[PDB]
Amino acid sequence: KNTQTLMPLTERVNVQADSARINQIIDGCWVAVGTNKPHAIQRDFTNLFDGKPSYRFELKTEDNTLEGYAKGETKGRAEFSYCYATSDDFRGLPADVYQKAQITKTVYHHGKGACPQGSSRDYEFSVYIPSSLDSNVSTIFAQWHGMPDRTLVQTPQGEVKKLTVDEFVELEKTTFFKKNVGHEKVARLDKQGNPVKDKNGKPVYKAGKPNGWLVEQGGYPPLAFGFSGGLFYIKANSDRKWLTDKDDRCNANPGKTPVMKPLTSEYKASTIAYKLPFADFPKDCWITFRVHIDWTVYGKEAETIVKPGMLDVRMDYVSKHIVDNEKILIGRNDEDGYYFKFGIYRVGDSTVPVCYNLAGYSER
Ligand SMILES: O=C(O)C1=C[C@@H](O)[C@@H](OS(=O)(=O)O)[C@H](O[C@H]2[C@H](O)[C@@H](NS(=O)(=O)O)[C@@H](O)O[C@@H]2COS(=O)(=O)O)O1
Ligand SMILES: O=C(O)C1=C[C@@H](O)[C@@H](OS(=O)(=O)O)[C@H](O[C@H]2[C@H](O)[C@@H](NS(=O)(=O)O)[C@@H](O)O[C@@H]2COS(=O)(=O)O)O1
Ligand SMILES: [Ca+2]
């Protein structure tokens, strides 16, 4: 009933498919993604950081709104993305550039907030973990995410090739994509033999059988900071395959994979760079992470590792050098780069409630 200390921020931008409208942008630099329940993300006027409102993220137990990897598994999301495009990013261009970017899901590739392939960048942000946070949460609170372009496809005959935007736009007319997998696009039909339309007159389609096409979509985040199994962990992922293979689920478990011993497949590596028992992670105070990433350089279609990456992390609240300039494989073999998000990404088929605050982001 006191609604003065917290301000719901409920606008959500589909950053891959839609430009952010000015009145959806937060503090001139963020848009929000994930569930839009009023408590999911709020500006917090009580817990100030550097004398300014911080951001309170909350997922209650019922707040998983996304399908997880396995049938019957779900996941939850309330995050800020530092990467999005606005209408100004398409200013003066032919109308079809934006329209085709929505269909190819490459809208945010036209916007600010990404770091290119093989680049080096410094990041800083702060987190505030309440003492009430359950030690068995399974949540990623900051991540650096790839930006694959789904115009890189595999044909039914197994050829990996780059479609032009126009070619992809044509393919999407006949193909219903379920994540990365193409299916025959089938019109649902009424009884007079006509295509069904929703209440707004929009034609409705469903997926038929797989049609052989695959597109580059999804993939693990190259870097994630989170809690799992009673540990705070930092996990780095690398994928050197030109077209990522979604079936190759090379993914280290902080509870099972020893620290700094990469788990590898033929193309992927997943490394737990740091672990700290949950009780040793400070509570009810602001912790500032300083992160330096030298992104791995990959050889594109050659699939080589041209140059290894490196990861450095400091944790201040005292300064602990928790990841000390580690040579590491980190990134994705894509044409495009990486963007930062923070918030709640509740994974591992968990519904344990999550709530904490974040603030103070910068990158250089
Ligand atoms: O770590 C994640 O946030 C995450 C990994 C992504 O690879 C993707 O996984 S997936 O299960 O959906 O395949 C989901 O990431 C993107 C997702 O790729 C994207 N789909 S797209 O628009 O068709 O390209 C969309 O669903 O957004 C999610 C998260 O991105 S966002 O939080 O910046 O919006 O989850
Ligand atoms: O081992 C996995 O591949 C894996 C474990 C699952 O528990 C799943 O979490 S769940 O809540 O969806 O069930 C999970 O998380 C991945 C997710 O699959 C991936 N999407 S994809 O690459 O496009 O398929 C992406 O969003 O990253 C998350 C982070 O994985 S994590 O669980 O290791 O944190 O995948
Ligand atoms: Ca790729």
- Return residues with CB closer than 5 A to ligand 3 (ion): 333-334
Same domain, 105 and 214: no
Show the domain range for 200: 149-218
Contact 184, 244 (CB under 8 A): no
Same domain, 278 and 352: yes
d(CA 225, CA 318): 20
Same domain, 131 and 280: yes
217 lines ligand 1 (CB under 6 A): yes
Cβ neighbour number for residue 93 with a 10 Å cutoff = 11
What are the structure tokens assigned to 289, written together? 């992470």
Contact 316, 287 (CB under 8 A): yes
Q: Which three-class secondary structure state does DSSP give residue 22?
A: helix
Comparing CA positions, the residue from 228, 279, 230, 276 lying closest to residue 251 is 228
Q: How many A from CA of 347 to the centre of ligand 2?
A: 7
Provide the β-strand partners of residue 276. Answer: 232
Same domain, 7 and 51: yes
113 lines ligand 1 (CB under 6 A): no
Kindly report the backbone phi and psi dihedral angles of residue 253, in degrees, each rounded to the nearest multiple of 5, phi listed first: -105, 125
* Helix 95-104 / helix 165-174 crossing angle, nearest 10 deg: 50
d(CA 30, CA 80): 6
Q: Would you put residue 52 in left (φ > 0), alpha (ψ -120 to 50) or beta? A: beta
Same domain, 57 and 89: yes
Which of 218, 250, 274 is the C-terminal boundary of a domain?
218
Same domain, 277 and 346: yes
Chain breaks in the chain (C to N over 2.5 A) after: 317
d(CA 267, CA 269): 7
Which of 218, 250, 267 is the C-terminal boundary of a domain?
218
CA–CA distances in Å: residue 292 to residues 4, 59, 166, 302, 364: 37, 29, 38, 27, 10
Strands 231-239 and 331-332: parallel
Provide the β-strand partners of residue 336. Answer: none
Element (H, E) at 239: strand 231-239
Q: Which three-class secondary structure state does DSSP give residue 302?
A: helix
Q: Give DSSP secondary structure letters for 56-121.
A: EEEE-TT---EE-SSTT-EEEEEEEES-B-BGGGGTTS-HHHHHHHHHHT-SGGGSB-EE-TT-EE
Same domain, 188 and 228: no
d(CA 67, CA 74): 4
* Method used to obtain the model: X-ray
d(CA 110, CA 118): 19
Same domain, 3 and 115: yes
Which of 176, 201, 218 is the C-terminal boundary of a domain?
218
R_g of the chain computed on alpha carbons: 21
69 lines ligand 2 (CB under 6 A): yes
Resolution in units of Å: 1.5
Amino acid, res. 142: A
Cβ neighbors of 322 (< 8 A, separation 6 or more) are 234, 274, 276, 313, 314, 315
Same domain, 171 and 242: no
CATH code, domain with 141: 2.60.120.200
Alpha helices in the chain (DSSP H): 95-104, 165-174
Q: How many A from CA of 196 to the centre of ligand 2?
A: 34
Q: Would you put residue 97 in left (φ > 0), alpha (ψ -120 to 50) or beta? A: alpha
Element (H, E) at 128: strand 120-128
Cβ neighbour number for residue 245 with a 10 Å cutoff = 17
DSSP summary character for residue 258: P
- What is the number of the ligand 2 atom nearest to the C-alpha of 253? 33
d(CA 110, CA 100): 12
Same domain, 96 and 236: yes
d(CA 144, CA 338): 6
Q: How many domains does the chain have?
A: 2
CATH code, domain with 195: 3.10.540.20
* Closest protein CA for atom 9 of ligand 1: 218
Same domain, 111 and 158: no
Cβ neighbors of 352 (< 8 A, separation 6 or more) are 61, 134, 136, 137, 138, 346
245 lines ligand 2 (CB under 6 A): no
Same domain, 169 and 247: no
| Residues in binding site for Ca(2+) | 149, 216, 242, 333-334
Contact 354, 57 (CB under 8 A): yes
Cβ neighbors of 190 (< 8 A, separation 6 or more) are 196
